[PDB]
Design a protein around this ligand. Structure first.
Ligand SMILES: O=C[C@H](O)[C@H](O)[C@H](O)COP(=O)(O)O
Ligand SMILES: O=C[C@H](O)[C@H](O)[C@H](O)COP(=O)(O)O
Lengths: 263, 255, 263, 255
């Protein structure tokens, strides 16, 4: 089955930033034809730690920008919703509706996404055990969702730290396709006080682990200049490094693939 | 004065609310030192299973809560799950409660603050104590003035919560602190035997109030059946924490 | 039953330091007659993080100093052992043989302590669940121990941090007398790199919690001048504060006592 | 070269060691790229229960280990639990193993280092990756030159261990890193289905070797019966990690 690579700037800082990243993702989609690329970017960071942090330019502007990306590059689109009413308007452009980690248990949000007929990707809550995602998938199926993904993005490990329990990949695979969030899994929640931290040096090794274990795709935030990002400046991958990372995981995936266990 | 937020987990029927309301009213008259607040959720919006009990809706809920405040003159508190709910809930709720999983949802916090009512934020199981400072700042920015932070356990491995009591003195630096005695012993995805022991710890450490779910027959509750406190045991526990508080308060550290 | 207060300098820095602390503990034992005091001090810090940290002046010197304390003040004595051969010589002076947290699973050490006929106090390993201490007590009883204590000293919570799960007090009470370690429970393992850290501001509130929940005693390291201690300088309680802390926990214990659950 | 430490958890009988030794010898000849080390404990000194299997003693153990090295010419490794054991164990053990619970016991580390042999320290479930720097320093101070640090999981709530793979690159800054594939999936006080998946992760991330407990019939093992790898599956797993390593090594980060 075609491997999924969900990538793009964390937040829709501007329609320009989106077209700049979209151009590169389009180039890579032409090179890595065995990969199904999905362009991602949030129209709103509705859960920043500080009230003073960047959130976005609203849904209207965001959907418009995302539609421009899909229109210009013919790339699939995914973005996250935060309240039920957003599912309908977002579904007009998003091929995959993403459910934020903190909201993975909000029944009405999951149901709102499911009835749009679009694919739904739920970030696994940092408080959730792998086996408890079975009910999350059940809610979605109940709500009409036919294409469901569960994304591993780390688990609460003491204060301001997340650990990735790779046992979660084969467990969740029992009831949904699994995506590994390579950039959020290394962030340090509220690590910088008014904002979260992160250790970029661990992004690559952990993503290698993910494909070695076996997953159906990877999620990576990428920005031309991470140091200047308005969100997740410590974890967003420099855009020029994307190509090399993807080649590497496809290589590791291939050699490890024959050993992937059957669920 | 010391706050005691109590009531049935879910509004299974205004009839149930009135029964629990009668007992809380009685205790209210017996313990004038304490400020009681009746609590009950009009919707369990985050159940693990799609087939579990959620409730009878916001309208039926706000109505039942109205009956309690009118019939007993008790302050009210219930939780909201989406921004639009803040306004209609504020009609009856003296304190608007923010769910633990939603403690970082900026719009929900702002919506609650904008109603002018008091806001009680359940500290997320993923949050460090010091990270609640920013939560308070959001509410203040939104015009909130009576702000509470509730300790309800922290993620400890899978399907388990631990109460780090160091959180009480830490959160007290920027808000009044409430200890959730019933959800702190619950096992995500709980043991009633630990409710009283940990509540005693909370008052010995020092907090501004306690939160307890109580039901005439917990075994038959449609929500938190394993942790809801039997109504008949509420008086004894309140008297107990008041006595412990009286002696221990002498040692509560300043700010 | 008489409440136990185990207190003293973390390490036997000198026989003088011991007599200075012993004098105060003796004074308090005369005041708090409802308390059973036990003077504690390690003849060896066998598990310091750094090879450059203070360990002690050897068993011989240590036992001699401890015997002087017992001789001069008539105070009961407790100290910890690290290898089986130490149980015999230590048992000559120690009324209670303490088993280090990291060694709570070492069968031969527990057995060595048990056959001396002395009381045995096992620090609960930071890796151990409360219910798993049942087997620890079983080993001791098997080895002849008649007076057994289990000490709560925190549990691993993420990196370089410990949390106290007070549910452990009533659980462990099912099979042994329970002691709360008020000073080690707030230490930050390897927090200072070459040494462990700690937050003294939390010692008092957590000890109040312990007696409110209910335990059979408390363990506190105290030093005339903590800032100058050769070990646990960040967590040892200033000696002048001991009296007040003890009065407070006896007061809280008394008012909470009628609510202690029966096991 | 890549290290593969394997063998039965406990020395249930030198007869068992010889059987496992024969297979490890065969693989040894098949994979010249790998340096195999036969492992087996002469004593399980930290069992939870007093009634569990410990072993046949140090003498019977060192004797059986001698038979394996002589009969197959395989390097040896076993763990010590008290200082006095270092010297006699060093007679046969090429690598002296330090138990996880004992990774901070200074005298045990010094005793092992003093024998001149290589020392492999199991990282305690309570240790942070960066805290192993001091462990290495102790061994160096003691005269050790071939030092290994083994990843075997970290305490995650109660009765559970999680493998934080960030530890591999971190510990590599001051020592060769070995991944314990069998104890990392064990549940303190485990699931065999996760052994292979996590070992693949370890080599994809980058390590200097793997540690695996293998037994002809794990179901009948007197120790770690739920996690010991069936002997017949060892060849397949080794071939698998060699292939993954070959491709992934290209991306291992420097130091
Ligand atoms: O959903 C949350 C995102 O993944 C981040 O971890 C989030 O936006 C980080 O927020 P902050 O830096 O404001 O803590
Ligand atoms: O047994 C260990 C003691 O309680 C300490 O936590 C220990 O001696 C601290 O050692 P260090 O400061 O050298 O890490």
């Amino acid at each position: 089955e075609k491997f999924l690579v969900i990538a793009g700037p964390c937040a829709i800082e501007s329609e320009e930033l989106l077209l700049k990243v979209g151009e590169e993702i389009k180039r890579l989609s032409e090179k890595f034809k065995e990969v199904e690329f999905v362009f991602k970017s949030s129209f709103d960071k509705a859960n920043r730690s500080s009230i003073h942090s960047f959130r976005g330019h609203g849904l209207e502007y965001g959907v418009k920008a995302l539609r421009k990306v899909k229109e210009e590059f013919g790339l699939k689109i995914t973005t996250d919703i935060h309240e039920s009413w957003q599912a309908e308007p977002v579904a007009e452009v998003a091929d995959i509706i993403q459910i934020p980690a903190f909201l993975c248990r909000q029944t009405d949000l999951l149901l709102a996404a499911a009835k749009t007929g679009r694919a739904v990707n739920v970030k696994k809550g940092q408080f959730l055990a792998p086996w408890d995602t079975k009910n999350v998938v059940e809610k979605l199926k109940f709500g009409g969702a036919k294409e469901i993904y569960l994304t591993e993005r780390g688990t609460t490990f003491g204060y301001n730290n997340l650990v990735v329990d790779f046992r979660s990949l084969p467990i969740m695979k029992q009831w949904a396709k699994v995506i590994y969030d390579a950039t959020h899994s290394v962030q340090l929640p509220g690590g910088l006080g008014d904002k979260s931290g992160g250790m970029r040096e661990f992004i690559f090794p952990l993503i290698r682990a993910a494909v070695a274990v076996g997953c159906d795709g990877v999620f990576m935030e990428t920005h031309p200049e991470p140091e200047k990002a308005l969100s997740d400046a410590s974890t967003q991958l420099p855009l020029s490094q994307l190509e090399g990372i993807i080649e590497a995981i496809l290589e590791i995936r291939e050699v490890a693939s024959k050993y992937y266990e059957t669920i």
